[PDB]
Design a binder for this molecule. Structure first.
Ligand SMILES: [Ca+2]
Ligand SMILES: [Ca+2]
Lengths: 144, 144
């Protein structure tokens, strides 16, 4: 047993499944505005102390145009059987620990592939992807 | 019985399931703008009180570019059976109380694993993950 796996969820009493999603989006906005300011002031100031009062009135009008596009991918995995080939009715879903080479398709679709495994209980597996316990206490692995 | 569980939902008359989701997202915006202000003022002021009126006209034009990416994981659990192996037609769903080591996969995928259990009724279980009542009043637990 070489590989190390991360546990992703355990259910003692039924199914476990997962969905993994990535979104990429690009957006842009164009804004055009105009403003009109009409102020005035009255200031009286002779022999020593000066005092003013101002009244300003502003009016604005803008218009923005946005457009955007996104793309998303979503992979879903379900636990259906153990390595022994019996139906899965409980316990844990595992994800291979190696980080992996991202897949792209054009500018806004991206995947990052996972390799998922399901086991009877929550004791961590060691066997390689597509490799099964060969002996009772799982110190050897054979091709599935 | 060692473990403590939190109740997450009870249905006296059918199924209970849950879905747990985590999203991580990074975004950035770049904004470039340009403004033109064309003001003027008329102020008349001799012997002793001064008075002005101002008219300002502004026009702006900006453009923002945003791009973002997110990633989300969603694990779903369903209650299918009791520890006795009968079909689940009512009862409660439980979540192990210990906080748990988060799994990551690159920059925007995160899980935090749960261990879920389902029971016949709403009396709190104490048995360890993958461990079942061994006796009528559940003071001892055996491997499932
Ligand atoms: Ca086989
Ligand atoms: Ca059993």
């Amino acid at each position: 047993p070489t590989a190390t796996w991360n546990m992703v969820g355990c259910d003692q009493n039924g199914k476990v499944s997962q969905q993994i999603s990535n979104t990429i989006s690009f957006s842009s906005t164009v804004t055009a505005g105009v403003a009109v300011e009409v102020s005035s002031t009255i200031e009286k100031g002779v022999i020593f102390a000066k005092a003013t009062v101002s009244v300003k009135v502003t009016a604005s009008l803008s218009k923005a145009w946005t457009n955007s596009q996104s793309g998303t991918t979503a992979i879903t995995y379900t636990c259906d059987n153990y390595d022994s080939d019996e139906e899965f009715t409980r316990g844990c879903m595992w994800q291979l620990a190696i980080e992996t080479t991202e897949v792209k398709s054009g500018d806004l679709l991206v995947w990052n592939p996972q390799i998922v495994k399901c086991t009877r209980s929550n004791t961590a597996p060691g066997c390689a992807p597509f490799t099964k316990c060969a002996n009772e206490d799982c110190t050897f692995c054979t091709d599935i």
